[PDB]
Each structure stands twice: as structure tokens, then as C-alpha cells.
Amino acid sequence: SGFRKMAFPSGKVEGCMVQVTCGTTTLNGLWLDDVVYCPRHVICTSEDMLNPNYEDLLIRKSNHNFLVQAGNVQLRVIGHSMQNCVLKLKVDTANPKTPKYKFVRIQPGQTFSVLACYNGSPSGVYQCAMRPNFTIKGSFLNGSCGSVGFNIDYDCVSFCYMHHMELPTGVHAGTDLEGNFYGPFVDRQTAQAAGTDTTITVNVLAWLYAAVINGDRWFLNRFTTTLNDFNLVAMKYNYEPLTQDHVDILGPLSAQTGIAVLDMCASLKELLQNGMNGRTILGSALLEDEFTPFDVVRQCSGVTF
């Protein structure tokens, strides 16, 4: 038993991280087969970032301006191109450690593991949810750009995130592995507002079920509610509306615990209206929303990879 924010084992992704230097800037790249993917702002100087013309900046670059190093072995770049906001450097050698992999664009509220990297070397791994406003609350210092987020399915690494930038508010934004930003953000150093961030309601309910499975039951009650009625109070507290799709997703945790989904909503309704009254749930004094229902099932069932 026990419940912890758990990241996927990072070994498959560690062997794909390289260092990409383009004169002034060094960040991280992903080496899959004979292509290195990295944020295209590697080609910007400091002052370029205010209003970069990326097509013009790319045209002034030659392959020899791209120093790619895997370990203390330099990779010979034989071409460069640009897919949306991701640079793609063609290299002379395919990565022998290339795992089976997919590129995937995740949805708000889904989670993934971040392998935080500096100078191409992995530094640590942690779990992250894509917020409803398409930001993530990670831990990223200068030079962390190009770090990637991923999920693992047995043997297949599904890459879903590449880190590009920290907003002035200190939250983080990036792209899928096709270079498309999550959310409305752009890769230029301008002030950019993230929309209103809401709480991932379906993830809070999944975590409450995690709590019951692990022995925390005090918040359970004997009250009913409809989906519509729960949503009327959820919006007051800046919770995402709960849909029938979410109820269906939570089905298996309902069955394992014998607590109907709408009964668990009635328990959350009372937690939002009356607070915790100084009590904790799974060692936390706040309602946690960065566990998906699949996250809980996996951690309380022990799936391996």
C-alpha cells in the first residue's frame, strides 16, 4: 500500500538525450534514429528572442553552426529543417539506443513524466499534469529547454511534451514533438497570459478513491447528488465541469471500492463547501488534482514496463 506521485522509469529516455549548442545557446535535444529534435529558439541570440524571425534566422544558419554532442562524442550534423517550433537536425548516425516510440499530443488534465535535463545530461524525473490552461507546473532552470515529457506503454515511449519556456509568472509551456505549442503560447520573449487555471475535477475524484483504497475514509458521507447539481457547486470553486465521460472513466475505481461515482461527488461537494476542518487526505491538506484515474489504477495495480 501507500500512494505517491510516481514517474515512469526514465532509462529509455535517458539514452536519447543529447546536448545541442548553436553558438551562444546550449539546450537539450532528443536523438531518435538519425534526427535530433530541439526547440528552435536554440538559434536565437539573447536580443533575437524579443521578436525572432525564425525563417530568416534559420536561413543564416549552416550545419556547422550546430554543435551536437552525445556524451563526449560529437555528432556530425548533415542538415537542418524546421517543423513549427521544433528544430530537426539530421545527423550522420542513428541512435542505437532508440526505443520504440510514438509522438502524441495529450489533452488537458492528462499526466506525464518529465526528465529534466541540463547540457544534455539527465538531472531528475517527476510527474506533471497538463493544466486546463495548457501550462505545466514543473521545475526548470536556464538550459532545461528541450527536456521532454513522456508516458510508457510496456515497451513503447509515447513522447508528448518538449519544454520551451517559462512564462513571467513562473509556469512553463512547450510543444508536442511536432513543434505545436500546447495552448496559445509562442516562442518569443513577450509577455503572455495563461488563461484562468481550473482544477481537474475528474483527477480529484480519482485521488479520493486512491485515498479510500489506502484507508482514508473520513470524508465519505451518505449524501446523494446529480451530475448537474454537483456541477452547479463545482463552478463556484473553479472546478472543471464533470461530464458523463468522466463518470465513465471513474467506473473501475467505483467498482473496486463500492462507492458510486456520484456518491464520491457528494463527498467532494462537502469538502469544497466546508473545507477539510484541519484533517488530511493521503498526507495532504489540499485537494490533489494531478493523478488521473488511470494513474491511480496503475499504482494500486502495479503495472510494469
Ligand X SMILES: O=C(Nc1ccc(N(Cc2ccsc2)C(=O)Cn2nnc3ccccc32)cc1)C1CC1
Q: Would you name the residues annotated as active-site residues?
A: 41, 145
Residue 96 binds: one of ligand X, its own copies, none (C-beta under 5 to 8 A by kind): none
- The residue whose Cβ lies closest to ligand X is 165
Asked whether position 32 contacts its own copies by CB under 8 A, the answer is no
Q: How far apart are the C-alpha atoms of 281 and 140, rounded to whole Å?
A: 28
Q: How far apart are the C-alpha atoms of 182 and 119, rounded to whole Å?
A: 24
Residue 188 binds: one of ligand X, its own copies, none (C-beta under 5 to 8 A by kind): ligand X
Asked whether position 123 contacts its own copies by CB under 8 A, the answer is yes
- Please identify, using beta-carbon distances, which residue of 39 and 202 lies nearer to ligand X: 39
- Please identify, using beta-carbon distances, which residue of 1 and 196 lies nearer to ligand X: 1
- Please identify, using beta-carbon distances, which residue of 37 and 101 lies nearer to ligand X: 37
Residue 301 binds: one of its own copies, ligand X, none (C-beta under 5 to 8 A by kind): its own copies
Asked whether position 118 contacts its own copies by CB under 8 A, the answer is yes
Print the binding letters for residues 269-298 with its own copies: x by CB under 8 A, - otherwise. Answer: -----------x--xxxx------------
Q: How far apart are the C-alpha atoms of 2 and 256, rounded to whole Å?
A: 17
Residue 197 one-letter amino acid: D
Residue whose C-alpha cell reads 501550462 in the numeric block: 135
Taking CB under 8 A as the criterion, the residue among 76, 137, 217, 279 binding its own copies is 137
Which region, judged by CB under 8 A, interacts with its own copies, from 31-39, 84-92, 140-148, 180-188?
Answer: 140-148
Report whether 139 contacts 126 (CB < 8 A): yes
Q: Please state the closest distance from residue 272 (CB atom) to ligand X, in A.
A: 32
Q: How far apart are the C-alpha atoms of 32 and 97, rounded to whole Å?
A: 8
As a three-state string, the secondary structure of 164-176 is EEECCCCCEEEEC
The DSSP annotation for 109-162 comes to T-EEEEEEEETTEEEEEEEEE--TTS-B-----TT-TT-EEEEEETTEEEEEEE
- Please identify, using beta-carbon distances, which residue of 15 and 241 lies nearer to its own copies: 15
Which region, judged by CB under 8 A, interacts with its own copies, from 75-83, 110-118, 182-190, 250-258?
Answer: 110-118
Q: Which positions touch ligand X (CB under 6 A)?
A: 1, 24-25, 41, 44-46, 49, 140-142, 144-145, 164-166, 187-189
Burial class (CB in 10 A: 0-12, 13-18, 19+), 132: buried
Residue 10 binds: one of its own copies, ligand X, none (C-beta under 5 to 8 A by kind): its own copies
Q: Please state the closest distance from residue 137 (CB atom) to its own copies, in A.
A: 6
Q: Please state the closest distance from residue 228 (CB atom) to ligand X, in A.
A: 40
Closest CA to 212 of 301, 109, 300: 300
Ramachandran assignment for 83, one of left (phi > 0), alpha (psi -120 to 50 degrees), beta (any other): beta
